[PDB]
Amino acid sequence: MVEKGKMVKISYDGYVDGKLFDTTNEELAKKEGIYNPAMIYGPVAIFAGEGQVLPGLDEAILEMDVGEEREVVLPPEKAFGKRDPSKIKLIPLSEFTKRGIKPIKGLTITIDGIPGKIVSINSGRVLVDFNHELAGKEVKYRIKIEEVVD
């Protein structure tokens, strides 16, 4: 099939929790009500088997042909990862104050270059989940290799 390092152009949908969270189809982007005006639509180029896409997308692409389309189910391990409890940290309120941040339950904040979701605040102790937003989530893609190019 398509082997590691081959520059292919790919089309992909991709759903999480029923709703669609990512696509190269702009017509479907409007219809689902997710269309971001600052998004590069149509097929995009990648080097197959090189971490440029989710691991499970890389695998499917390696066992596909030029012009082929597949629907693929990605378990968390193959998508954005499993949720890791060690990425839930308890941070002193003062650390937020000095940075001009007012932490609020359910707020997503950037701390030291990194996004976190605020879980709770108790007694000057802020619990932050730094796991990826979609970690622990099954994603579903439809992927199509439009062309190969070497």
The residues that touch its own copies, with contacts defined as CB under 8 A, are: 5, 7, 9, 40, 42-47, 84, 86-87, 89-91, 110-114, 130, 149-150
| Cβ nearer to its own copies, comparing 42 with 73 | 42
To its own copies, the closest distance from the beta carbon of 44 in angstroms equals: 4
Pull the structure tokens for residue 60.
């499917």
- As a whole number of angstroms, the distance between CA 102 and CA 141 comes to 37
From the centroid of its chain, how far is CA 20?
A: 12
- As a whole number of angstroms, the distance between CA 143 and CA 79 comes to 14
| Cβ nearer to its own copies, comparing 18 with 122 | 122
For the stretch 95-102, contacts whose Cβ atoms lie closer than 8 Å and that sit 24 or more positions apart, written own/partner, are 95/126, 96/126
| Cβ nearer to its own copies, comparing 73 with 89 | 89
To its own copies, the closest distance from the beta carbon of 86 in angstroms equals: 4
To its own copies, the closest distance from the beta carbon of 60 in angstroms equals: 19
Which helix or strand (DSSP H or E) is residue 26 part of? helix 26-31
Nearest alpha-carbon partner for 117 in 136, 135, 133? 133
| Cβ nearer to its own copies, comparing 28 with 111 | 111
To its own copies, the closest distance from the beta carbon of 69 in angstroms equals: 18
